[PDB]
Design a protein around this nucleic acid. Sequence first.
DNA 1: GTGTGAACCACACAACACCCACACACCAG
DNA 2: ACCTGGTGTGTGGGTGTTGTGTGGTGTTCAC
Length: 218
Amino acid sequence: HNKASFTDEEDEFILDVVRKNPTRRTTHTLYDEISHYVPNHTGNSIRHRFRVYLSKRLEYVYEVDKFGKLVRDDDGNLIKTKVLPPSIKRKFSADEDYTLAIAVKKQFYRDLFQIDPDTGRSLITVPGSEPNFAAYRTQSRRGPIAREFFKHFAEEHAAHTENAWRDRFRKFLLAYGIDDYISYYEAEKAQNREPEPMKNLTNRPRPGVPTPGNYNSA
DNA sequence: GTGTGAACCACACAACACCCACACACCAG
DNA sequence: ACCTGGTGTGTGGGTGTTGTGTGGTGTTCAC
Ligand SMILES: [Ca+2]
């Protein structure tokens, strides 16, 4: 209802906002926010215009600091860069799912047998004999896991957050099976082919709850 | 009396709608 | 205090749908 053309000025405005909030280039909200200054168009309509009609023209973006604020030079001027900052939601590389599954198995093996996988070597000081990891199978174990496990892990592999790593463990690793993934990962790695991350394991809903990513007129 | 010449239906494609698995989140029991 | 399940939220990378400014083009004050 009442379609409108994107003017030269409106397009230039969109590009400018994206250049000024580059961490948010693939969001939906940013384009919704631009619709405040661009009354004729919707969030959906602005985002599409950019993505399809304008991105091939971006050329540069403006550089931003650690604190997510635009960086300025000595005399107030903004810094042009052909470097895109990281997005808000980072994806899981197979190497990350393996690094997670191993650390969980390590923690578990130490929680269970009270032995150091690698050294092994008792954590208390009874004399087994316990399985020589990777001989161990997680098999139905799902905890307990300390918030400290996730905190130090996220400290070590900062690409993802503590909450990010936990939910990857809960919804992805526990769904696929800790042993199942480690075996799969190693199977591939041996066969000179790069393995793939865990996918499609999300099993969740809702009544109302409108479809996300639809910033329309109504 | 025979030619150039100054509004219905299609249709390409832009405007806009809508999609959904999951990354990252927070809280309660 | 601690783990852990239940669940909110909106990003990321799209695809699906509709409305519309410009083709045909048919006549037509006929000039
Ligand atoms: Ca803005």
